[PDB]
Amino acid sequence: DITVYNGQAKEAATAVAKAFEQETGIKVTLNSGKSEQLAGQLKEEGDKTPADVFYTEQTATFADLSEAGLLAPISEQTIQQTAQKGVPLAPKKDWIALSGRSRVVVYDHTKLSEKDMEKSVLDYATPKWKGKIGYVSTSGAFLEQVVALSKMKGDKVALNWLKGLKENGKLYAKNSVALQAVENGEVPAALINNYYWYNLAKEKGVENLKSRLYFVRHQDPGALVSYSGAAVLKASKNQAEAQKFVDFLASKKGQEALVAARAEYPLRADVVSPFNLEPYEKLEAPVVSATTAQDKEHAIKLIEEAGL
Ligand SMILES: [Fe+3]
Ligand SMILES: [Fe+3]
Ligand SMILES: [Fe+3]
């Protein structure tokens, strides 16, 4: 049996854990928390950690652990299972990207069509969208978007975008609130994440929704995908079962368990989500370096500088 430090949504972690125990007979104990806190605990605990695997919603959090020599190598064959073009790879082969969530524009299709949408996420923060674009400045994925903009286009462009949203956008407290605002006709469009829309669509049925999704694609900063993944702890004295779990998460069956439980994009090419997601490859996500704590501190300063 193994212990998994879990930073991923509980529905996902519980679903893949269950499917692992059913397929192998090996029991999984999840110890759940914030990935940043969990990684900190794994560094503090060092070679005394009871964690066998670290399952996360953000592969960027592996960087420090890899740098500290705390992660074990994974099989190159396992890594290749999810190694589609654009998917982050561990240079030391000591973690694996498993799935993704995407930035998206949700819009009221009875007020706008795709003809009204922008080819760049930058263009939603302009006077054409005054009073007509929702955004969630407090959300984690919004912060990831800002980091991506700074990296891809520099600070002036990112800051200008944030100023644009301050002047032209409508602020919402949460992604779910922004989605309901579009559904209820308060705002014709909003910047959110994909899984919110697909959850609403799976629950209520798409024929009963006013809102649809527009994907900017072509490696625009607005096509940003955030990657979930797993790693085995070097300190684990149960390498065989830890590696079996990670191998399982990258297998067809493990990916199937994940996508049934949550509307993330599988990174296997041969699995299809029952949420009716398009293939990962079609998203055309940009290639962006992992978010560091420094990246985040700096994006927070841009948000403040912009009046948000
Ligand atoms: Fe969240
Ligand atoms: Fe989220
Ligand atoms: Fe959320």
- Residue 299 sits in the same domain as residue 203: yes
User: What is the number of domains present in the chain?
Assistant: 2
Query: Which method was used?
Result: X-ray
Closest C-alpha to 206, from 139, 277, 271, 257: 277
DSSP code at position 57? S
CA of 47 to the centre of ligand 1 (A): 30
Same domain, 44 and 167: no
Distance between Cα 196 and ligand 3 center (Å):
8
Regarding whether 284 and 270 lie in a shared domain, the answer is no
Locate 2 and state its tokens: 């193994």
- Alpha carbon distance 82, 92 (integer Å): 16
CB contact set of 9 (below 8 Å; sequence gap of 6+): 57, 262
211 and 272 housed in the same domain: no
Identity of residue 38: L
Compute the half-sphere exposure of residue 131: CA atoms within 13 Å on the CB side of its CA.
Answer: 2
Rounded-to-integer distance, Cα 68 and Cα 265, Å: 30
CA distances from 107 to 69, 117, 183 (A): 45, 9, 8
Residue 256 burial by Cβ neighbours in a 10 Å radius (0-12, 13-18, 19+): buried
Cβ atoms of residues 106 and 179 within 8 Å: yes
77, 173: one domain: no
Ligand nearest the Cα atom of residue 226 = 2
Pick the ligand that lies closest to the CA of residue 176.
Answer: 3
Å from CA of 101 to ligand 3 middle? 11
- The residue length of the chain stands at 308
- The Cα 252–Cα 98 span in angstroms is 11
135 pairs with which residues across the strands?
171
Pair (64, 185) in one structural domain? no
| 108 and 5 belong to one structural domain | no
Cβ proximity of 200 and 209 under 8 Å: yes
Residue by residue, DSSP assigns 238-294 as: -HHHHHHHHHHHHSHHHHHHHHHHS-PEESSTT---TT-PPPHHHH-PPP-PPPPHH
Rounded to the nearest angstrom, the distance between the alpha carbon of 25 and the centre of ligand 2 is 31
Cα 32 from Cα 189, distance rounded (Å) = 34
Within this chain, do residues 52 and 137 fall inside the same structural domain, yes or no? no
| One domain, residues 234 and 255 | yes
Q: Ligand 3 centre from 107 Cα, in Å?
A: 18
Model resolution, angstroms: 2.1
- Cβ contacts of 143 within 8 Å, gap of 6 or more: 296, 299, 300, 303
User: Ligand 2 mean position to 100 CA, how many Å?
Assistant: 11
236 in helix, strand or coil? coil
| Cα distance between the two ends of the chain | 47
CA 268 to chain centroid: 16
**For residue 234, how far is its CA from the centre of ligand 3 (angstroms)?**
31
Same-domain check for residues 188 and 263: no
Write out the residue range of the structural domain in which residue 197 sits: 102-225+278-308
How far does residue 239's CA lie from ligand 3's centre (Å)? 33
**CA of 11 relative to ligand 3 center, distance in Å:** 13
Do residues 194 and 224 lie in contact, with contact meaning Cβ atoms separated by under 8 Å? no
Q: Are 30 and 13 in contact (CB under 8 A)?
A: yes
CATH number, position 115:
3.40.190.10
CA of 173 to the centre of ligand 2 (A): 13
Assess whether 165 and 188 both reside in one domain: yes
**Same domain (yes/no): 94, 139:** no
The DSSP output letter for 117 is S
Alpha-carbon distance 263 to 1, whole Å?
A: 28
Q: b/e map of 55-64 (b: 16 or more CB within 10 Å)?
A: bbbbbbbbbb
Distance CA(215)–CA(118), nearest Å, equals 10
Q: How many Å apart are CA 263 and CA 7, to the nearest integer?
A: 17
